[PDB]
Design a binder for these strands. Structure first.
Ligand SMILES: Nc1nc2c(ncn2[C@@H]2O[C@@H](COP(=O)(O)OP(=O)(O)OP(=O)(O)OP(=O)(O)OC[C@H]3O[C@@H](n4cnc5c(N)ncnc54)[C@H](O)[C@@H]3O)[C@H](O)[C@@H]2O)c(=O)[nH]1
Ligand SMILES: [Mg+2]
Ligand SMILES: [Zn+2]
Lengths: 1113, 213, 170, 57, 32, 94, 222
DNA sequence: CTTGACAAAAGTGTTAAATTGTGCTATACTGGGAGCCGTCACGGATGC
DNA sequence: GCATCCGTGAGTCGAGGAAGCACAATTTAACACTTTTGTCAAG
């Protein structure tokens, strides 16, 4: 299967490491490789240098250096034992007695820092988790126009999230500038006087403007001394507190001058310098030195605001939604922030501990309490919104999840607090954030995916690469630039024709400040690297993207994530070229480090002899259960003695074929309605797919049980379960666990557990029964683990962890835990959801035999039948072109790589189809067969429809039909041909994770809630279906009063009513009349608890007791 | 992609508003039920067959769909004689009757149709059978005891998602049902009279003149 | 939340009548469990209700006559199919269940426009009316074949659709 | 009107604010138990302060 | 959780009684 | 649709009265074990079982067929409920 | 003392109580300032209040001190060893009379109850109480099988004689009361204890014979 | 139908060990810490 | 008449589970002893 590549755009640079956004940021944060003396003031090192030294105010706790030890357990051990993959963090601290002049130095153990795996995901509590980058407003100074009053602007000073209050500066109608902090508004003149500014300085600096400077001059504040002005400012900010100079200056310093409490940030400082044209010494609004306050940013901000109000040419407002004004916090920044919070708590504990208790005899180890830091870190890595449970259905799933950017999370936007402004695709999203890919629904526009070529810079601003164009020739120099820098140049398009390096087109389509323009080659300053940089990883994997509507390409890209690995997965016929890169960068496959020869090949491990001679053994991950239940296995693709070059493939990862991403099957697809089984996106498949095991996956389910200690006695996991026959215990071994390899069905026992019964006398009927049968009641009862309905399979693994095992930290009171991994081989069935890369999705509605599917004149039946009516409404024409190219490849025996927006076009597909028809019909001519009568009738009908040129021979008409992508398709039932030619091709169809087997649920009676006594919800808990308000409204509209009453009382919460109804049904009688629900009783009791007398009356207004006298004294 | 994302966000933020409006409509008209065959009221509404078009400034026949939506399955309050056909009082207007009325209007014989409507229904805590008309789900007079309030609320709220959101579309419907004061509210004449324009560069004033006011 | 309620993915059934839906055998067994126990007690399948329930607990202990008893039970009875959101009153419709081999509910195409349901992965809930009043209300008022006109406008709501219209026009 | 000021605070039945033991042995309780505990603690502290002749502040 | 005053729960149709011919004739004969 | 549904709808002034009558007749048939049916042995609804044809156990279908035959008198304030139940028990003991 | 389970104002009020106690017990003859003596009582009252009121399930002060000492020892060993200590090291460091089992039980006791209203998921639409079944009230299946067992037992007892059935119901609590002893039933019937035992055994044997010949009551035994 | 001998099952009465609750620490300490933030529209009082 | 603070609302399913120390007052496990049967021989 030779690969033919289309396209004329030559990329000067390759795709950057797709996981670098997660990996490089955490490497910068930890700095575990750089020696401590060479560490820069970033990340947790910056946090240490910020919080430390701690001063009692003569005891000083200073920090010298920190180191990270080797992790106690490897990744596999942490996953198996449900541990957290982390490295021990120790800090070196010194205690200095200022009065005494003695130093005590020792290394204190601060705790454990979770480590990142090579793929970019953490292992928290044995579960793979991914930290999602958060997009937020970049700190700095912005100038937004006031919407309430036209012609006026308001200045906003934004620090880092939870690192200071937002400052507002506004021009009041009176002409006096107002500063707003923490919802409190006051005259800015007071705080400006606190910074030691005189009338002459303000007159000389801000006087070259309108009446704003005159309004800024209030002799009441200017005549006031800076100390009295500071006291008045403190009184205005915090009323009631006594005016004290020390407290006032401390509060002001902590509000606008304390680096530990106020942090504008590196990005904020850079933005302030870029906008206001100043050089901030630090990252604070004001500087407290020599016992006095010095201005840093307030005066330049006020000057810029006054100039913008006046209307100077060089100053303009700032766009809040501009992607240059919006930055990204990766895993490193969030982890550093949480570490800083924990370290601040630790410093507070040290300070409150170092001033009390044996001050002379102190050591840094005793003072330092590391519990708050570890608590904050574990809270961030477990219970944070941005720390999401890893989606690893396929390597592409994890790859996208690591590259996701979420506007939600702690300190960010909210799902229902977000308007259209944040959800729209700004003009600066070009080449930095994927426009099409986003989760549709309530989270559309709030979660996005990073572009393919985009990379987050040091400050957190997304950059995109552009080729420098000078003198009309495009050079190989590539500049990674942000949106604010991008807005200053005219950037051409990657599809502009080039005569080598010189631009050939006289009229070049370019972008100026985000708007499309037509310019000359001389005016071109930058060029796009490639069309791929605009779209993310998923969208770059959709061939013929230019022919798909954005709303449907969104669905296609999203569903590419949900495709499950298949035991016979094969790469698509029509590719875009990123499959190999996705597989390589997802770290799912196995590749040789350098040149060498493979010495041993096995299903479990591969031993390779490199050129230097060293033996390297790579274990093969075999049938490991992913987070989503899919089976992730690596299959060797080499043989003993085979020589491999550096970077060559050694073992295919999950959902991969020879290093190419294989999320589905290449199946013969015919586009035609079929007996209504294609109705409303439904898909018809052939039984031939099941015969040769296509769309067949492996799913592993984990069932966990725990034997604990109980006051009644310790629960024992044993094979001897009381009142059970030998048939039920056939599969259980001597230890009470199901033997490995046994087939389990719903209701079968996986592990046997007996629990001591609560000491309570039995009901008299049971006692009489026991006396009649002479069977003494045992002291234990069956509490074993059984397969839930709708599940089962083959037991493939049993893990038994016991208390006292090395590294197994069981919860207190739990003797042991048993986990059973049961694997089932799922085949395609009716109700399973299939899809394709172009967003065409549907559930399999019929599985026809091979003899019923339409077949080609050569006898080849089609495998999948698609409804054509899904094309015109969804406007996803790319699937048609993929079908044509797949037909050409199927009859030519080759695969194609057509990159998005630069690849296969209509003439190329037509000539490929011409070659395919040439070989296809030459084979028939050589076999000695002419033209079918049915083919002749179809050709006549087609020429009546204008599809083929009249007067040509049947061979020429058939060739024309093939060039149109249509073939004469016969009917498998009647044998007569389909009256019109049918588009038949080879299309790549994925099997999605949504399967009817895991979604079907039913329930008659089961668990009920605690308070309302209503049935629970969810298939896992065996709950009922929610009959919400809208269903009740529908029942009322039908007027089904009795059905609604039943669904409200008999089937939901009428305890006596439901018990009597069940007893009547099992006795063959009709259910009785329902009674008052328990929910209304809860309502009445809660209203009474609110001191409201709710009484139910009758026709004569007499009270009616709905509690049957149980609540009456 | 800008327009596609705008449409997606519009749909996402419109489905919730449509559902909330449907909930309001259900909760305000949950008590409306057909409670009697006839309340005996003599009031009615004159459904107009002609719309006063302003570009031509004259009465023009309304669309067939509008007349069908406003007259199908309704009881005639007063007997109507059109095209030699006498529709007596208390006769339910079927589709054939609506088409006959439309043809009569096209012949210039009738201007408005007097029909019984829930607005004029005097039934307490509900409506009457002869005021509601047909049960549109069965094309026959409404059965006594049907929860027409819930049906009405669901019928109004179901196509709220299909309305375009981009004073127009679903927000217009919401502000109409809430009786909200529009921001760009129109100016209406409080009393009848002759209009007089006093357009001047300084101010624009309109005078309504009567015999003494 | 209600008892005797299930949920499953829907697929298109062209062979079904307008008043029929394809209820999976397992879902029917679980939803009609008390009626099935009573029927098994009536015949010789089980001695009493407890033995029948124990037989139904284990999948491999279910004989072939249990399915025949289940088919006998559902004779005449109907189940309510529901699809969220229930925007209008036709979001819940009564259908006569038909036992099918599989795990997906077979839905008639004509009611799909009434349900606003396609087959791109939709899920629907099944509810079982119990008494004579509920069954009569479902079969007389809530039946799919009895609600052919839309209450909103009076025009037909269960009418020919995409493929049907395409074929008839062609 | 004087009924609008509570002299005796009603207490919801404990089953509507359950303190249940899960199968794992952990105890799960509602926030109403915590609110009632805070109210009772403050009331008893006020009673003790009044009995001890605490100052007006 | 009561019977709603609409549809089959409406007072107009809630109290309707169905009786056969034989039992009705027996009642009339035994009464009159 | 149910057999003869148009006639059943047209025989009453309100469809909910039809539903009430059908449900009450079905419960009356269930209580007496189908011994009070007005259907001839050649008119009883039948179901196809592997053993053979048997009587239909769905009381709603029986009530609908009986009301279709037209031998059932339905209305409001016909006879006292207690007297009606006593007479029906006397005629058809159960 | 803030952040230890009690709010700031509660700590202030408990310290006020301790201050009142200190004023009651203060002596000025020793020439020590009031702050020195009052601090002891204030911190004692605050700590006692924290021990007695910071937990939903109250724990005695001695057990609170034991838990605090155990936590301090565990923290010291954790910082010394650079890892989380096992129960053996903690028990060894605590002192005599402590083993791994006692440490595990103390840690189990020190487990605060979990709130029933803690949300799970990005949306605030789920709670713990939605996933905890009610295992107190009998299920419909349990009530149905209890009623079936009662009916079957009543039908089976009909085969017994009038006196034997009454004796068995009295002796097994079928009259909703506690199982009457042999002497009580004998005095009720005016018969000696031995004859009551003999007739009860004979009736039980007859019921066993009937069950063997019918096998209509075995399924309810479980 | 009863009349005596035995052998546990349960209850009564101490006994200290375990558990629980209250009292007491005497240099001098004398007013808090966390926020902090991207939504719009619509009652409806609250004043000027 | 109008600017402004406050309160309420913004779709449905499903799938997501940081002192000890002494000392006195209260409870209870452990036994020791009558008391009460449950049963067995004697017909
Ligand atoms: C990452 O987000 P996820 O949560 O993982 O999203 P998916 O897994 O991709 O969603 P899905 O549901 O599995 O499938 P799909 O969207 O292709 O349609 C499946 C069908 O369910 C229904 N349906 C979907 N959303 C619904 C909603 N909010 N309310 C009600 N009905 C909804 C529609 O009738 C869809 O036609
Ligand atoms: Mg759908
Ligand atoms: Zn009326």
């Amino acid at each position: 299967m030779e690969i033919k590549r289309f396209g004329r755009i030559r990329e000067v640079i390759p795709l950057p490491p797709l996981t670098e956004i997660q990996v490089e940021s955490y490497r910068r944060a930890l700095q575990a490789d750089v020696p401590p003396e060479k560490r820069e003031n970033v990340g947790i090192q910056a946090a240490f240098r910020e919080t430390f030294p701690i001063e009692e105010e003569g005891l000083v706790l200073d920090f010298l250096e920190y180191r990270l030890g080797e992790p106690p357990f490897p990744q596999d051990e942490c996953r198996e034992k449900d541990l957290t993959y982390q490295a021990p963090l120790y800090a070196r601290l010194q205690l200095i007695h200022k009065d005494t002049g003695l130093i005590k130095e020792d290394e204190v153990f601060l705790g454990h820092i979770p480590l990142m795996t090579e793929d970019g995901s953490f292992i928290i509590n044995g579960a793979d988790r991914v930290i999602v980058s958060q997009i937020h407003r970049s700190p700095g100074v912005y100038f937004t126009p006031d919407p309430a009053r036209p012609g006026r602007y308001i200045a906003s000073i934004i620090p880092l999230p939870k690192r200071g209050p937002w400052i507002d500066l506004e021009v009041e109608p009176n002409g006096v500038v107002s500063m707003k902090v923490n919802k409190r508004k006051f005259p800015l003149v007071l705080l400006l006087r606190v910074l030691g500014y005189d009338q002459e300085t303000l007159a000389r600096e801000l006087g070259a403007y309108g009446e704003l400077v005159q309004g800024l001059m209030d002799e009441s504040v200017f005549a006031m001394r800076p100390e009295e002005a500071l006291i008045r400012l403190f009184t205005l900010l915090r009323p009631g507190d006594p005016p004290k100079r020390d407290k006032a200056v401390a509060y002001v310093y902590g509000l606008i001058a304390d680096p530990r409490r106020y942090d504008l940030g590196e990005a904020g400082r850079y933005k302030a310098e870029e906008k206001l044209g100043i050089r901030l010494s630090g990252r604070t609004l004001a500087r407290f030195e020599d016992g006095e306050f010095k201005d840093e940013v307030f005066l330049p901000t006020l000057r810029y605001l006054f100039a913008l109000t006046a209307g100077v040419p060089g100053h303009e407002v700032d766009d809040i939604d501009h992607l240059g004004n919006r930055r990204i916090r990766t895993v490193g920044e969030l982890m550093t922030d949480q570490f800083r919070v924990g370290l601040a708590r630790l410093a507070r504990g040290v300070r409150e501990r170092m001033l009390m208790g044996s001050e002379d005899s102190l050591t840094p180890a005793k003072l330092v309490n590391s519990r708050p830091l570890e608590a904050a870190i574990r809270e961030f890595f477990s219970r944070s919104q941005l720390s999401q449970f890893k989606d690893e259905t396929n390597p592409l799933s994890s790859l996208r999840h690591k590259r996701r950017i979420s506007a939600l999370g702690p300190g960010g936007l909210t799902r229902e607090r977000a308007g259209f402004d944040v959800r729209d695709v700004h003009r600066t999203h070009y080449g930095r954030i994927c426009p099409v890919e986003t989760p549709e629904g309530a989270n559309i526009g709030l979660i996005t995916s990073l572009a393919a070529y985009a990379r987050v810079d040091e400050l957190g601003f997304i950059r995109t690469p552009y080729r420098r164009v000078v003198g009309g020739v495009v050079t190989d120099e590539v500049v990674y630039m942000t949106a604010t820098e991008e807005d200053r140049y005219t950037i051409a398009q990657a599809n502009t024709p080039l005569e080598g390096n010189r631009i050939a087109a006289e009229r070049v389509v370019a972008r100026r400040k985000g708007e499309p323009v037509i310019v000359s080659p001389e005016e071109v300053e930058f060029m796009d690297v490639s069309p791929k940089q605009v779209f993310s990883v998923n969208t770059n994997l959709i061939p013929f993207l230019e022919h798909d509507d954005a709303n449907r390409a969104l669905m296609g890209s999203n569903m590419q994530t949900q495709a499950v690995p298949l035991i016979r997965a094969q790469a698509p016929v029509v590719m875009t070229g990123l499959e190999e890169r996705v597989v390589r960068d997802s770290l799912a496959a196995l590749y040789a480090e350098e040149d060498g020869e493979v010495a041993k090949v096995d299903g479990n491990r591969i031993v390779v002899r490199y050129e230097d001679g060293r033996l390297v053994e790579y274990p093969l991950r075999r049938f490991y259960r992913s987070n989503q239940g899919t089976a992730l296995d690596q299959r060797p693709r080499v043989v003993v003695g085979q020589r491999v070059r550096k970077g060559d493939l050694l073992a295919d990862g999950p959902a991969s074929e020879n290093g190419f991403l294989a999320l589905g099957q290449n199946v013969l697809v015919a586009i035609m309605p079929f007996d209504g089984y294609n109705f409303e996106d439904a898909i018809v498949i052939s039984e031939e797919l099941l015969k040769r095991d296509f769309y067949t996956s492996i799913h592993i389910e984990r069932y966990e049980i725990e034997a604990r200690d109980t006051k009644l006695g310790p629960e024992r996991i044993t094979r001897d379960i009381p009142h059970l026959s030998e048939a039920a215990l056939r599969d259980l071994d001597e230890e009470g666990v199901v033997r490995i390899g046994a087939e389990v069905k719903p209701g079968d026992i996986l592990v046997g557990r007996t629990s001591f019964k609560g000491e309570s006398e039995p009901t008299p009927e049971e006692r009489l029964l026991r006396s009649i049968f002479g069977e003494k009641a045992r002291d234990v009862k069956d509490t074993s683990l059984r397969v839930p309905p709708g599940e089962g399979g083959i037991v493939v693994r049993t893990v038994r962890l016991r208390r006292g095992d090395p590294g197994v930290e069981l919860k207190p009171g739990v003797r042991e835990v048993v986990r059973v991994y049961v694997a089932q081989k799922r085949k395609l069935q009716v109700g399973d959801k299939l899809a394709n890369r172009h967003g065409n999705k549907g559930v399999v509605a019929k599985i026809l035999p091979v003899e019923d599917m339409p077949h080609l004149p050569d006898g080849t039946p089609v495998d999948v039948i698609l409804n054509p009516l899904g094309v015109p409404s969804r406007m996803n024409l790319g699937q048609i072109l993929e079908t044509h190219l797949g037909l050409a490849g199927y009859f030519l025996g080759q695969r194609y790589i057509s990159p998005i927006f630069d690849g296969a076009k209509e003439p190329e597909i037509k000539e490929l189809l011409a070659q395919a028809f040439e070989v296809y019909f030459g084979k028939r001519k050589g076999e000695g067969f002419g033209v079918d009568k049915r083919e002749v009738e179809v050709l006549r009908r087609a020429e009546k429809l204008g599809l083929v040129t009249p007067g040509k021979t049947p061979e020429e008409q058939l060739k024309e039909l093939f060039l149109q992508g249509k073939v004469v398709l016969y009917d498998g039932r009647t044998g007569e041909p389909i009256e019109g030619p049918i588009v038949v091709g080879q299309m790549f169809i994925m099997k999605l994770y949504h399967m009817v087997e895991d979604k079907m649920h039913a329930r008659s009676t089961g668990p009920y809630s605690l308070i309302t006594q209503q049935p629970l919800g969810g298939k896992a808990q065996f709950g009922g279906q929610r009959f919400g308000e809208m269903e009740v409204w529908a029942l009322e509209a039908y007027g089904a009063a009795h059905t609604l009453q039943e669904m409200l009382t008999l089937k939901s919460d009428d305890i006596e009513g439901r018990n009597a109804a069940y007893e009547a049904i099992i006795k063959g009688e009709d259910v009785p009349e329902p009674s008052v629900p328990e929910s209304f009783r809860v309502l009445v009791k809660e209203l009474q608890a609110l001191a409201l007398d709710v009484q139910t009356l009758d026709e004569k207004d007499n009270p009616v007791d709905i509690f049957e006298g149980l609540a009456s004294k | 992609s800008h327009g596609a994302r705008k449409g997606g966000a519009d749909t996402a933020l419109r489905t919730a508003d449509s559902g909330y409006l449907t909930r309001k409509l259900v909760d305000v008209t949950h008590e409306i039920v057909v409670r009697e065959a006839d309340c005996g009221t003599t009031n009615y509404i004159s459904v107009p067959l002609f719309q006063p078009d302003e570009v031509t400034r004259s009465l023009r026949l309304r669309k067939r769909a509008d007349i069908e939506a406003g007259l199908y399955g309704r009881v005639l309050a007063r007997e109507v004689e059109v095209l030699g056909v006498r529709l007596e009082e208390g006769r339910y207007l079927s589709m054939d009757d609506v088409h006959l009325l439309i043809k009569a209007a096209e012949a210039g014989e009738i201007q408005e149709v007097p029909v019984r409507s829930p607005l004029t229904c005097q039934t307490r805590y509900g409506v009457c059978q002869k005021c509601y008309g047909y049960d549109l789900s069965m094309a026959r007079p409404v059965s006594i005891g049907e929860a027409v309030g819930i049906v009405a609320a669901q019928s109004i709220g179901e196509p709220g998602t299909q309305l375009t959101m981009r004073t127009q579309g679903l927000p217009r419907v919401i502000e109409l049902f809430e009786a909200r004061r529009p921001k760009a509210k129109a100016v209406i004449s409080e009393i009848d009279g002759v209009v007089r324009i006093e357009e001047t560069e300084e101010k624009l004033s309109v005078f309504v003149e009567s015999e003494g006011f | 939340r209600v008892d005797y309620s299930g949920r499953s993915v829907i697929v298109v059934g062209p062979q079904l009548k307008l008043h029929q839906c394809g209820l999976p055998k397992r879902m029917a067994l679980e939803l009609f469990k008390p009626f099935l126990l009573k029927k098994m007690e009536e015949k010789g399948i089980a001695p009493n209700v407890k033995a029948a329930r124990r037989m139904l607990e284990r999948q491999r202990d279910i004989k072939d006559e249990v399915w025949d008893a289940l088919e006998e039970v559902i004779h005449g009875k109907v189940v309510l199919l529901n699809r969220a959101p229930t925007l209008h009153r036709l979001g819940i419709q009564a259908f006569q269940p038909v036992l099918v081999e599989g795990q997906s509910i077979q839905l008639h195409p004509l009611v799909c426009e009434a349900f606003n349901a396609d087959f791109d992965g939709d899920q629907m809930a099944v509810h079982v009316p119990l008494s004579s009043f509920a069954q009569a209300e479902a079969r007389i008022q809530m039946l799919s074949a009895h609600n052919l006109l839309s209450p909103a406008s009076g025009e037909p709501l269960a009418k020919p659709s995409r493929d049907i219209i395409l074929g008839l026009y062609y | 009107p004087e009924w609008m000021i509570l002299e005796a605070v009603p207490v919801l039945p404990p089953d509507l604010r359950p303190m249940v033991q899960v199968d794992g042995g952990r105890f799960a309780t509602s926030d109403l138990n915590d609110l009632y505990r805070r109210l009772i603690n403050r009331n008893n502290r006020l009673k003790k302060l009044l009995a001890q002749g605490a100052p007006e502040i | 959780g009561r019977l709603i005053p609409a549809g089959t729960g409406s007072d107009f149709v809630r109290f309707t009684q169905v009786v056969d011919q034989k039992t009705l004739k027996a009642i009339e004969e035994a009464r009159k | 649709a149910e057999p003869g549904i148009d006639k059943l709808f047209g025989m009453v002034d309100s469809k909910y009265r039809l539903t009430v009558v059908v449900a009450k007749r079905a419960q009356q048939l269930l209580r007496h074990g189908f011994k009070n049916t007005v259907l001839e042995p050649e008119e009883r609804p039948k179901m196809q079982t592997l053993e053979g044809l048997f009587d239909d156990p769905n009381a709603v279908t029986w009530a609908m067929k009986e009301l279709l035959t037209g031998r059932l008198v339905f209305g409001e304030n016909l006879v006292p409920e207690d007297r009606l139940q006593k007479e029906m028990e006397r005629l058809y003991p159960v | 003392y803030t952040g230890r389970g009690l709010s700031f104002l509660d700590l202030i009020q408990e310290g006020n109580q301790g201050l009142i106690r200190a004023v009651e017990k203060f002596e000025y003859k020793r020439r020590f300032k009031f702050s020195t003596y009052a601090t002891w009582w204030i911190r004692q009252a605050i700590n006692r209040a924290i021990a007695d009121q910071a937990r939903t399930i109250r724990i005695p002060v001695h057990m609170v001190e034991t838990i605090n000492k155990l936590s301090r020892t565990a923290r010291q060993l954790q910082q010394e060893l650079g890892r989380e200590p096992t129960y053996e090291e903690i028990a060894e460091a605590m002192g005599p009379g402590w083993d791994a089992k006692r440490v595990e039980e103390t840690l189990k006791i020190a487990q605060e109850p979990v709130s029933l209203e803690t949300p799970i998921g990005d949306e605030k639409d789920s709670f713990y109480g939605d996933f905890i079944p009610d295992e107190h009230l009998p299920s419909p299946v349990d009530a149905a099988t209890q009623s079936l067992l009662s009916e079957e037992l009543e039908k089976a007892l009909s085969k017994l004689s009038e006196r034997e059935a009454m004796v068995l119901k009295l002796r097994k609590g079928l009259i909703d009361g506690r199982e009457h002893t042999l002497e009580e039933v004998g005095a009720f019937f005016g018969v000696t204890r031995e004859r009551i035992r003999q007739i009860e055994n004979k009736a039980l044997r007859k019921l066993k014979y009937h069950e063997s010949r019918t096998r209509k009551l075995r399924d309810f035994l479980d």
